[PDB]
Amino acid sequence: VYAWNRKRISNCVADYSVLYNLAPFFTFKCYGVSPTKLNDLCFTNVYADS
Amino acid sequence: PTYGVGHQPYRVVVLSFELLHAPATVCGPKKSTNLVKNKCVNFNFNGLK
Amino acid sequence: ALGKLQDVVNHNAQALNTLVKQLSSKFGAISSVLNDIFSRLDPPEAEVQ
């Protein structure tokens, strides 16, 4: 955590179903957007942290 | 694993976004179609519904 | 010489044009466009905004 990792996602098509419906992801809570509105929208400047 | 839950390691991933305020690149599973000229329609335009 | 009539006309133009400018105020919402609010939120919070 002190030396965490960041990733830049660019030039892809977003499909959250494969990840929403996977077993280990028992927690999916979002802030600025509804959890089920992801597939209805386009994105730019997408980054992730691990 | 001898520690109780609440001490087990939990993998955390957070996602950052900017909403529509730039040319969108990453998109969802929507399928495009040809536009129209001078006809009253409704559009999506990368999210501008 | 006839600034009174111009005053009436200008007062109306300003009064109505402020109205057009009012739509650019979030009022403490996510944004000033209803469509985005409906297209990014679930009914409970969307309705609240």
From Swiss-Prot, chain C:
Coiled-coil features, chain-numbered ranges: 6-49
Domain of life of the native organism: Viruses
Role played: Subunit of the fusion protein that is processed upon entry into the host cell. Mediates fusion of the virion and cellular membranes by functioning as a class I viral fusion protein. Contains a viral fusion peptide that is unmasked after S2 cleavage. This cleavage can occur at the cell membrane by host TMPRSS2 or during endocytosis by host CSTL. In either case, this triggers an extensive and irreversible conformational change that leads to fusion of the viral envelope with the cellular cytoplasmic membrane, releasing viral genomic RNA into the host cell cytoplasm.
Protein's UniProt name: Spike protein S2'
Protein species of origin: Severe acute respiratory syndrome coronavirus 2
